[PDB]
Structures are given as structure tokens and as C-alpha cells.
Design a protein that fits this description.
The protein is α+β, with helices and mostly antiparallel strands. It has three helices and six strands. The chain is globular, with a radius of gyration of 13 Å. Its main location: secreted.
Length: 107
């Protein structure tokens, strides 16, 4: 489960990310070196997902008590790509395919 549609349904259907996701910190603990693009060598079949996404720029809709999280989409080993899914604690789902510059609602 690593497609935009897959993960969105999943997030709304189950209220968590699918088993293939791990956080950055979690990843570093297993030997992931961002500079080497080695996530698949140290954690086969996993993607970075679940971290808190600051929304400093105020690009995504704010609401007191609403927390945003991100997850990588379409990852297939090597260096991470520019696709991400963004989901709020009240299950609003946005997408970015340009490294968090622009967002469009998907759920």
C-alpha cells in the first residue's frame, strides 16, 4: 500500500498508516543514512511516513487542535522522491508531488 489512493482510503478506512511505514527517527535507528539512499537495504519494503508536518507556511488549513502528518508516496528504493500524502488528525487528505510547495485535496 504505497499509492495515493491506497493510502488515502486506508487512512480513512483504518485511521493509521499501513504496516509498510516507519518514521524518520525509526529509520535512523535501523541504519538509514539519508545521504546514501539506503532505506531498502536496512528495512526492505518500508517507506518513510508518519512524521509530524509543521505546516509552518500555513499552506494547509489550520484549526486549533488539528495536527498534520506526512507520508511518502510511490517510493521504490534509492533516494526519496517528491510525492507525499498529508493527513490531518480529523482525516482531511492532501497531496503534494512537488516537495510541499503546492497541495491539492484528495479526500
Amino acid at each position: 500500500i504505497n499509492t495515493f489512493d491506497g493510502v488515502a482510503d486506508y487512512l480513512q478506512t483504518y485511521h493509521k498508516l499501513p504496516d509498510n511505514y516507519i518514521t524518520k527517527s525509526e529509520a535512523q535507528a535501523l541504519g538509514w543514512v539519508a545521504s546514501k539512499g539506503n532505506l531498502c537495504d536496512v528495512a526492505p519494503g518500508k517507506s518513510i511516513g508518519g512524521d509530524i508536518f509543521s505546516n509552518r507556511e500555513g499552506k494547509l488549513p489550520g484549526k486549533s487542535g488539528r495536527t498534520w502528518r506526512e507520508a511518502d508516496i510511490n517510493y521504490t528504493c534509492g533516494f526519496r522522491n517528491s510525492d507525499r500524502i498529508l493527513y490531518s488528525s480529523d482525516w482531511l487528505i492532501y497531496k503534494t508531488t512537488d516537495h510541499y510547495q503546492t497541495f491539492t485535496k484528495i479526500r
